[PDB]
């Protein structure tokens, strides 16, 4: 079964997954300079006021908030989408230590972590049919960055040790992912992939460029978890990242400039 492992790991899973190697895979590294500011790009409408947590849970390579995405209470727009996406769930990435952990990348430099808040298109009615349509998902990508303690990933931290092996879930409930959210929403956007089996190219992928911070103490929390289940012999849950892939026939747009000297 695929992992993160040296045997199972990333540079594995095209045996399996042959789109692995496809022309429009996750995580990208994001070369600032290179992207494209485009003007028309319109401005991101995040209405999570009534977002409704309901579980976390850990599937044996990440964990998940899931949330009520039974009506448009929480919803993703605008920029480059068309329509509505509403929230089903979020999860993060992360590092063995706080040199790495992310996804994505900026100018080849690796966060500590990368949170991913996941949005289905209501064109198409639910999460499983949206997964299978190239403008089904948005994921909205936030890195973590390691600095001073963040009040709103707090609630998440506080409730880890409930869920350390695989298969493990707990109630979660009145979480706000606003707390989550930097204050400028200027954004990178591409079209790209799942960044897990099954790898599958349904992700309008917007990258935020202003991160949020991260404790080491509260990343560290992260690392507690395990891959396994219980019983099993112990592997930490770390480096749950997947590499950069190639951009190929892609061109990654940026809603703003990012070095005044090229304008
Ligand atoms: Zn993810």
């Not at 995040?46 to 390579?61: E, F, K």
């Amino acid at each position: 079964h695929w992992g993160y492992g040296k045997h199972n790991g990333p540079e594995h899973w095209h045996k399996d997954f042959p789109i692995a190697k496809g022309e429009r895979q996750s995580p990208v590294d994001i070369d600032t300079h290179t992207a494209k500011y485009d003007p028309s790009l319109k401005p991101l409408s995040v209405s999570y006021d009534q977002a409704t947590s309901l579980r976390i849970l850990n599937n044996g390579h990440t964990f998940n908030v899931e949330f009520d995405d039974s009506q448009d209470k929480a919803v993703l727009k605008g920029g480059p989408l068309d329509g509505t996406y509403r929230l089903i769930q979020f999860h993060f990435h992360w590092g063995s230590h706080d040199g790495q952990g992310s996804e994505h990348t900026v100018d080849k430099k690796k966060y500590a972590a990368e949170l991913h808040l996941v949005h289905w298109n209501t064109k198409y009615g639910d999460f499983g049919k949206a997964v299978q349509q190239p403008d089904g998902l948005a994921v909205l990508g936030i890195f973590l960055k390691v600095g001073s303690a963040n009040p709103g990933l707090q609630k998440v931290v506080d409730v880890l040790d409930s869920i350390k092996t695989k298969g493990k879930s707990a109630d979660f409930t009145n979480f706000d992912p606003r707390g989550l959210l930097p204050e400028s929403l200027d954004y990178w956007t591409y079209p790209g992939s799942l960044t897990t089996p099954p790898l599958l190219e349904c992700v309008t992928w917007i990258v935020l460029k202003e991160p949020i911070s991260v404790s080491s103490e509260q990343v560290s929390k992260f690392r507690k978890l395990n891959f396994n289940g219980e019983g099993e012999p112990e592997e930490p849950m770390v480096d749950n990242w997947r590499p950069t892939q190639p951009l190929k026939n892609r061109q990654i747009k940026a809603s703003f400039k990012h070095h005044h000297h090229h304008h």
